[model samples]
Every structure is written in C-alpha cells, then in structure tokens.
Target chain A: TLEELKKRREAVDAVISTHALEGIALHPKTLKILEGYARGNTSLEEFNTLMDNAKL
Target chain B: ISPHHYVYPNTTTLKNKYGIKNLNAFLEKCSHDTAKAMINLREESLPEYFDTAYLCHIHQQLFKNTFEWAGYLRHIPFTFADGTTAAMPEMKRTGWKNAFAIGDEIQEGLQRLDQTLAEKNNLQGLTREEFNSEAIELFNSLNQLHPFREGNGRTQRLFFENLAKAAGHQLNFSLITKERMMVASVAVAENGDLEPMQHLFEDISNPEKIRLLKEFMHTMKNTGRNVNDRPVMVAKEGETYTGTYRGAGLEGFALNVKGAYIIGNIDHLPPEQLKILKPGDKITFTAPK
Candidate 1:
C-alpha cells in the first residue's frame, strides 16, 4: 500500500517537474487528494480522478 | 537536504495509515504540499499558539495533512539518525524515545528565551535586529534537537520561525540559503557555541526580498545549449545552474531567490528581455541536463 502511495506521490512530482510547474498554485483540495494518495488513505485512481477535475 | 535527517524506525516502511513507507517517499510527498501551504501562509497569518510543541505538531500536520496520518503526533520513536551515531542527538535519551513532556517544557523555555531577548531593549538602546539574531539561535539550537515529529521538524520550524520573523517586521528571506552551512552551524551551536557559519548566511539575507535577486533574475535567462562546451562555472549562494534562457548566451552562477526568478552577475542579458520582465511580477524552477 505504501509503495503504491509512494508511486502516486512520485507521479505527481513527475508531472509537475516535467513542465517546470512547481510554482503553479495548486488547489487546496487537490493537495488533500495528494496526501490521501501518499498516505494510502485514498487510491491512485481516486487521486487522478480528483486531479483531472481539479484546477491548478 | 543537507540539514541532518529524520530517524524512522526499522518498521518504518509503508507501515501504517500514513502510508509513508519510506523517508524518500515521505519527503517527496512533503515537497508537493508545502508549496501550497507556503503560498497559503503568504495569504494567511499563523495561529497564536505557535511556540508550543502542539503548534509545532500542528504545523507539521498542516504541511503533511495531505500526506501523513501521523503528522500531528509526537515522534514516539527515538532520534532517526543518518549516521550510525544516536547518542549525539541530545533530544534522544539512551535506549528509548526522548521524553516528549521535557521537550514541551524546553520549547516553552526557548520561546521565553525569545521574549527575554526582545525585552533586551528595556534600556531603550538594543536593536530589534540584535534581539532577533541572538534569540533565533538560542531558539534554533533547542528546536534543532527537538525533532518533535518523526518527519517535517525542519519544515515546521521554518514556517514557524519565518512567520515569527514576519510578525516582528523582519522579512527573513531564507528563499536562497545554503543548508550545508546551516547543518554545520547547527552542530556547533549544539555545543553551546556562538553561531558562525549561520551568521555569515544571515549577512547575506535581507529582512525583505532582495530586489537584487530580481535584478539578478532579470539578468538570469540564459541561451547556452552546449552542456559540455559550457565553460561557465558560475557558483554563488544557493544553487548554480548553467543553460540558455531566451536565445541569449547565459553561462555562469545562477541564483533563484524567491518568485521563481533567477540571477547572475553576468551582464550579457538581453535588453529586450529586461524590458519584458517587469521585475515586479510573476513567480518561482528544477531539472538536470
């Protein structure tokens, strides 16, 4: 579960860094989703689902 | 990254509701959320109960609230050290986790010490700068060892102290600091000595944003593409990067202060580039190659 979470967090980092978008102002709720993904509190698909709907 | 590290237990991997299976994973997640929280702090003020360990825990929780289940809890395990040595961490006692209760007292005491330094102006002569300077180290030395959370001690303390600085009208721009010097300085201060390397770094920091950093960034956009032909070994305060900016040949020391901007002393920056940059706006970069 932790591995999956770690992978999810890395996926976020990968997407962000690939575009040098580290400075983009992310939605607060999206951060919550990320935490959920990293903590295994939520699933990866659940995170991306929110991520897709969420605005940076 | 140079500033010491967290000491997670052997069973620390992906272990619980936190799902922070490892330190690297934990740090990666922290990297994501802290940006928004930092920006949030810019738009928000810190709560008043800041000096207590609960606040420290709260700060950790806020930063990682999106990531760690145990973010608000005190580190039940002992010092998670990088070196083989554990006894060196004063917050850690022999054979078990350090007493959280004592740490609470120490944090209060440290905050008291902070007040005491501010009160140094009783004679109406001591400078506020002098007061904060002296107090921060006395404050830092203790909290450096506090390591209250299993992770995010440094991050929480940074937000705590930075906000505290803002409250006092001291705009400590740690946006472009070197952590190795800080780690070394933290060690020396732990020995109850004066702050040295850190003092040097302080000399470099301004209470406010360095328009110089802006000026440097305006001058920062480079145009060099030859990675091996890049003879420009510009090394300065924080990070040094060599690459092209806007078709202009940029190869030298680059410093990205705050605002996602970069800078260098090299005067070859395009005039049109400078004209385009308001130097007053837009925000804050990473990569290899």
Candidate 2:
C-alpha cells in the first residue's frame, strides 16, 4: 500500500492522500494496485474509491 | 594478489556489498567513496614525501581559482587558521616561502602557477578542455596542500565556480546528484585524477539546469548566504557615499584600493586616504557615517 501511494504521489501534480495510507499493512495490496496501474487498464477512480472505503 | 586477481577481488567485494542493483548507483557510490578518501587525506596530516611548499602553492592557486569560479570579485584576502592571508601578487611578482607559513605556501603555489602561465601564455585564454584540465590540476594540488584546518572542499568549490564563470561557462551544481558530486569533487582532489571531476562537469548538459543553478546562486546571494566570501557591491544612485573613492574624496583622504573593488574591506584602505574623497568615486561608509 505504501508503494502504491508513493507511485500515485509521484504520478500526480497534486497532493490528496492521507498519511495513514503509507502504513506497511497496506503494502501488499498497494503493490498489486501499482502493478495494475502500471499496466494502464485499471480504473483510477474505482481504485481511489476502493482505497477510501478501505480506510473506513 | 596477481594484478588481474587484485582488481577482481575489490570488484567482487563491491558487487556483493552493494548488491549490484544499478550500474549508475554503483558508479556513484564508487565516486563518492573515492572523493571521501581524498578529503580524508587532506584533513589529516599530509604525507612527508609531499613538499609542503609545493602543496601550499597549489592551495593558493586552487583557492584563487575557486574564488573566481563562484563569481566572486578577484581580490579578497583569504586567510588560513593562523591568520596567514593570500592575495594575488603585483607586477613585481612574489615567490613562495617554506611550508610552515600557510601564506608562504600559497605564495609558492602561485609562483609555480606563474611559471605555468608564462609557459602557456594562455592561462586566461585556455580552451574549454585546457581550462577544465587546469582546474582539476589546481584542485588536486590544493588537496595535497591541505592548507586549512577545515572547509577546504567548500572553499575549492567556490573557487571552481568562479573559474568557470571567468571562462564564460556556468557551473550547474543543481544538476549534480548530491552524493555523487561531493564524492567526485573530493576524489579528484585526493587522487589527482581529473576524470571523475570532469565527468561531473560533463554530465550537466542541460541548458535549463545551468540557468537554474546560476539563478539559485543569485537567490542565495540575495538572501545574504555566503555563496562566496567576496561580495560585489554596486553603486546605488543618490547614496551619500559610493565606495572608497567617494568616501576618500568626501572626507578629503586617500586610500589604497585593490582588486577592482570586488572584495577586500574598507579597513585595508587608509584613514589618511579617507580624509579626502569626492563624489562619483567609490567609498565605504556605514549606515550612519
């Protein structure tokens, strides 16, 4: 998850993420999410929405 | 320790240590290490085989070059820990003394420089390659000089920057990766090898990067950071006193000024000279003076 967040952060010009998103617990899923993003077929909005819901 | 095997042992050891993930990273690390080692030697007591006199002469040359490279005025007095000062000699042309005196060492270093300049008759008009090579040589010589108690690299960097500017090129420190640039600079100083140092200069090929570095240095100057010890004070219109000349005329004094009014303190000028001054001449005055 941390890696995913880092990728997202680097990709965009704006800052719009929470600090807790960088935790190690989210890393595995983050890596998978990043792999999907890199493949360019993933829906970014859907991913963001899912990430937001996960925080709840 | 066969010659070929000797090299391979270190190579293998380094590869294992750094995990060999990226060639750039490995090269940067190697450069950094080499530079650090050179800096370390300079900071320590120099080897006995090296002539202190020769080393000091090199230090002065490097210091002067670095001073100019950083866009500083040509003449400001640079001193060592013991308060020994270095300045460019006048037409009479001074010679160096023994190693014990840092100032003398600088003088001696400059004397050798004079010889080199005379031989080439092109120190000021060197080709880009020659300029870079000479800069590297001067840097190495100063590293060998080990003239100061501390901050030699910082001083040399400033000198190098000035020298570059003098040659009509701008040095782009921002383009330099932080770790590697430091490493490379120190390495060149230590091993007396110009390759790594030259590589840093060569790698900065982007024109925008060059502009940005120059702007960054200018901004730093505006903020009153000591980018270089020499400050270039411009004459402001309507100011009561402009510089030493104006100040001297106003007070009806005469003072000996040096180095195109780029560096040096008002103290270097005489109080008697300050007794007489006129408008349109340079003078140094405090806010209330």
Candidate 3:
C-alpha cells in the first residue's frame, strides 16, 4: 500500500506539471482536448484529428 | 471517472495527490531537489537514436525523474497550442503508437549517418568547438523535430545534446546562454530556413577560430550546415494568415511570417507595429526574423 500510494502521488505530480506547462502555451481547443484526454473521452481517432486538423 | 483515465480533471491547479495538496509547492520541491541532481549527475551514457521515438520519451523521464511518473510515457491523446498551432518547443503531431516504430526506424538511420559524418569530418581542421558548435545544432534540430514526448521537450533535448557535446569533447555552455537566445536560435532552424542564428550562437559560446577553413565552411552551403534543418509549423494556403486571434500580443517581439503575416517572435516588433485583429477578421501567412 505504501509503494502503491507512492507511485500514485508521483503520477499525479507528473500529470499536473505536464498539463500546466504544456497548457499554458496551448490553444484553447487543446485544453478542451486535454479535458477529453483526462476523462478518457477521446478515441485514438479523435486524438489524430486534433493533431492533423484541429485549428485554433 | 473512467477506470482507464490517465488523470483526473482538476489536476491542473490542485493536483489532489496524497500529502501533496498543492501542485505548485510539490513541483517546486521536486524541482529544487532534481535540478541539483540533474546538473550534478551529468554525463550519463549517451542515448543512441536507434529508437528515436521511444528514447525521446525516456530521456525526458530521466531528466525529470524527481517530479514526474509519466515522464517517459507517450501521451495517450492529443495536444495543441494557443495560436491553434501545436504546443511543445517544436510542436509536432504525436505519432500513433502503431506508427512510432516505422517512423523511429527511418529517423534512426538518418541520425546514424549524421553521427558517423560528424565523427568523420574534421577535413576543415577547425577547432572542435566551432565544428561541434555547428554540429550540435544540426543534431539538435533533428532531435527537436521528432518531439515525441508529451512535454519537457526543449529542456530534455538541451540536456541530451549537452551530454552529446561532452562525449565528443565539445562544450555548448548552455548555462551561459539566455533562454531567449536559445529559443530564438532554435526557432530559426525550426521556423526559418537558416542556421546563421544558431551558427552565430555556437560561435559566441566557443573558442574564436574561424581561420580560413571555418570561414570556408561557413560561406558554402553543404550537407553539414543544413544538418536536419526543419520547421515544425508549415503554413498552408487554406489556412488563415496575417494572423487571427483573441486579445493578445507578446511584449517587444515580432517576426514576419514570410512577410505575409505578422508574428510575435524574436522581439522584432513592438506592440504598436502589430495590429490587434480580433477573431473572424480574415487572415493569410511572411509574417519573421
């Protein structure tokens, strides 16, 4: 349980850092997509569409 | 909450982790500790480019080993930028997991050649500093273009190259250079068809010896100078240019996008030089340094 908790705490830190730094300079649409990513709402195709065609 | 979600929603401001109630403080703590460790524990084994994509993720993991569990993992979904461009230093589409291997293999081959040539070519008899100054930029441009990881790209890539420079008995003196100059130099390669800015940067940090040979190399455009020169963003005809955006202007910076559109890069344009065109005002792209 200690190690699992340790692992989880680390995971949470990584997620926040990535989102804050990456999102700070990101398109508003990207935040919407990121929200999808966090919720697991985006399928792989949606991810691809965001990259290839999502305009700001 | 989906069973498979990578993270929770409110993770941005309040990263709701065990004992780490404040995301900012937790990251600050990790950074203070790891920053010292990374700098102190420098000169690790050079990461080979054999699996370029995977290594990109791994390198970032190691660099930020203190703060991030997902450091080395590929992003599951999508990402973009404020200007509708992708984010990250050299923003690129995250390749599909299925596609990573194929793309990685080909890039590894090209990278291998670049390394081989870098090791072979001293025909010009230039100071290893000057030679590698230019060499590092080309190598860096290649790595930056890959942009495989979710974040920490510029930071990880800088460290990776510093190690590469150390292995080759050269110095980039990245610490001596300002982050602004560093970004500008990198952007020139990624956005502009030029290495002069980087060339100028490398020269400034290294020993002064352009003796006839280095000058010769400089004047002539060859495979080495153009080493992996690439731009992460490409302006398409269908895309709006001249720029369309929300209320925003970077202070004391502007670069023309091919002279067709105005931009806020490289401190080239002050606030007045730029016109604040609200959204839906038609736009097209030479808007550069």
Candidate 4:
C-alpha cells in the first residue's frame, strides 16, 4: 500500500510538474483529487473517475 | 461579451465584496485582503504539486474578499484600454486564449507538459545551469500561455517558486525587480524569444551574482559612511585608540567604535595583536604613517 501511495504521489507530481512547465492552470479540483489519491485517501478507481470528470 | 458586468456601470472600480466604489479605496482594501489571505495560506502546510489547481487555490485564497470569480477561469474576452471604452487604446495589447477555448487549450498544454517533464525527470538531478535553462523555457511558456484573466504573474511566481523547491533548487522571485521581469516576460510574449528571460534566470539562479544583487538592493539602507560622519576615534600621530575588534571584513579587519564599523588594516599590527584579534576584544591601533 505504501508503495502504491508512493507511485500515486510520483504520478501526481509528474502531472503537476508537466502543467507547471506549460504554464497551464489545472481546474482547482484536479489538485484536490490528486492530493487525495497521493495520501491514499482516494481509491485508484475513484481517482481515475474524478480526474476524468474534471475538465483538467 | 459582458466585460462590464463586474465593473460599476460608470466607474473604473469593480463592484467588490466590500462595496467600495472609489478606485484608490478599493485597491487599498484589495491589497490588504490579499496580503492577509496570502499570510493565511503560508501558515498552513499546503500540498505542493506544482499544478494549475495549486495556482488557482492561491488565487482563490488571495482574492476571495475582492472577487467571487477568484479561483475560476474568466469567461469573457477583454483588453487593457486607456479609457472606458475597450476600443479606445490603439496601442494597448489584446488577445489571449479565447474564453471558450481556454479549458481545452490548457488541458492539451498540460498533457504535453506532462509528457515532456516525464522525459526530463521533473527537472531533478540537473546542474544549476541546466536547471536554469529549462526553468527559463518553462517560465516563458507559462507567460505565453497567460492562463488567468488576472493575477497571472502572482500565481505563476508562487507556482514557480514551489516548483523550484520540489526540483531541488530555490528561487527568490523578489531578487528580480518588477521592471526586469516585465521586460523579459514581454519579450517572450511578444517576440517568442527566450533570450531575455534566459538572461534574467541566469542572474536569478547564480549564487555569486545574486549575492551582489542582494547587496545592490540594500544599497540605500547600507550606504557607506560619509566623510563628514564623525570618525570612529580620532587619533593623533603615534597615539593609539582602543576600540573593540569586530572580526574580519570583506578585505580588512573591522573594529567597533561608538557603534560604528571601522575598517582598518591588520597587516602592520604586531603578530600577537594580529593573532589575538577576536570579535568583541579590545584592540589598540595607531594612526597609519
């Protein structure tokens, strides 16, 4: 589970880092969902569904 | 199309939550509110993701008192005009991502960013020069993107500073003056060139250069002593003046006399005096021949 959480955090960091480089702003909720996933509070399925639901 | 919706029907001031109509008063209140909000955000242990959402959250926290659309994307196209009408200023610049297309463009831009950074390893493990080069490109791209209708610079700085921290570097945005940053940003935005911004980043990320910049910035406060200022301790020829040693200076030894730093050469002093010159120790010195 720790390994899974670490992976999620890295993915989330990668996504954020990517957006930062482009100077594009993510929908505010995108960060909330990703942070939740990083902390292991959001399930993998929930994370994907939430990210998909947002406009990004 | 409804750019006038937020502004009072006949004034330059926006209809703020504080209901202030005077432009100066409205701005004062806005500044105060945003400062407090930024302080609040600083006190909390916020998550660092270097994402746009984090940027939006900062905007939301900062301008909640002044605007209801604080954290939201702007839905109207606008221009900076010298007068009330949007068309009056022929010299003014206009055009950004169309309101209708901002979301889509941002999404694609970010996805592209994700792909690029994945290859670069999020900019970690790079030398300072390499990091500076990549960071300048990133900053230029963001400036060109111009995502937010307002507060773009402020949010970008917070986003960038944290991003630098996460990537194993530090940034002091305040080290660069507003005029310099604007010049560089405008060059990138208008000419699609990164040279100016890259030069600014080079100065910003260099330790030795930045220290000199810090010294320059504090020039007014730390201006050197004037000729008329009372000498630390006036000494007659061959007469010694006893002053407390204040340790080493940039190129010479320093002494504290009447609460002022006095630069003196320690090379001619006795070996015992030179070896024993410690901070806060009293040392007697004669006028140089």
Q: Per-residue error at B139 for model 3, in Å?
A: 4.1
Specify the highest-DockQ model's number. Answer: 1
Q: Model 2: what TM-score for its first chain? A: 0.39
Please report the TM-score between candidate 1 and the true structure.
0.44
Model 2 DockQ vs. reference: 0.01
Please tell me which predicted candidate would have the highest TM-score against the true structure: 4
Best by lDDT: 4
Point out the higher-scoring one by TM-score: 1 or 3.
1
Q: Give the alpha carbon lDDT tens digit for every residue of B65-123 in model 2.
A: 22221212112344433334444322121452222224465456656654653565323
In model 4, where do residues sit more than 4 Å from their true spots?
A: A1-56, B46-48, B76-107, B110-121, B221-289
Better of 2 and 3 by lDDT: 2
lDDT (0 to 1) per candidate: 0.40, 0.38, 0.37, 0.57
Model 3 clashing-pair count: 20
Q: Using Cα atoms with residue i matched to residue i, what is each candidate's TM-score against the true structure? A: 0.44, 0.29, 0.38, 0.55
Query: Can you write out model 3's per-residue Cα lDDT over B9-60, one digit (the tens) per residue?
Result: 4564322222354565554444433332333233245443323443444445
- Candidate 1, residues B20-93, lDDT tens digits: the string is 75655554444445543433333344444434444454555445444333333343322332332122123444
True contacts kept of 4: 0.00
Model 2 chain B: which ten-residue window has the lowest total lDDT? B65-74
